[PDB]
C-alpha cells in the first residue's frame, strides 16, 4: 500500500552504449553519463550473460570509468550486456538490452 522510507532520489538510467573493441573472449563497452545522476556515482555495474543461454546467476562487472572490458567469456557466443549506475542512496535500472557477438574461433575477424 504505502512503503515508508527516506533519502535521495535514484540516479538516471544510461541509454547510450557502444562497443569499442569486441575480442574473441573479451569485449569492451563505452557509455555516457546519466542525464540526472542525483548525487555521486561510485561505479557502474555491467551485466553480461550468454544471450542464447540465460543463466539464473548473471555476472556483474564493476567499472569506475565510462569504459569497461568483460573478460572470461566464450568465443562465437552472443552476450547481452547491460550497464547501470549505482549510488549509495539506492540503485537504478539497467540500460537497454545490448546484443554483442564475440569473434568466432573458426578464424580471425578480418581476412
Swiss-Prot record:
Receptor tyrosine kinase which binds promiscuously GPI-anchored ephrin-A family ligands residing on adjacent cells, leading to contact-dependent bidirectional signaling into neighboring cells. The signaling pathway downstream of the receptor is referred to as forward signaling while the signaling pathway downstream of the ephrin ligand is referred to as reverse signaling. The GPI-anchored ephrin-A EFNA2, EFNA3, and EFNA5 are able to activate EPHA8 through phosphorylation. With EFNA5 may regulate integrin-mediated cell adhesion and migration on fibronectin substrate but also neurite outgrowth. It is found in: Cell membrane; Cell projection; Early endosome membrane. This is Ephrin type-A receptor 8. Belongs to the protein kinase superfamily. Tyr protein kinase family. Ephrin receptor subfamily. The gene is EPHA8. Heterotetramer upon binding of the ligand. The heterotetramer is composed of an ephrin dimer and a receptor dimer. Oligomerization is probably required to induce biological responses. May also form heterodimers with other ephrin receptors. Interacts with FYN; possible downstream effector of EPHA8 in regulation of cell adhesion. Interacts with PIK3CG; regulates integrin-mediated cell adhesion to substrate. Interacts with TIAM1; regulates clathrin-mediated endocytosis of EPHA8. Interacts with ANKS1A and ANKS1B; EPHA8 kinase activity-independent but stimulated by EPHA8 ubiquitination. It comes from the Eukaryota. Residues 10-105 form the Fibronectin type-III domain. The chain holds residues 437 to 534 of 1005 of the full protein. Phosphorylated. Phosphorylation is stimulated upon binding of its ligands including EFNA2, EFNA3 and EFNA5.
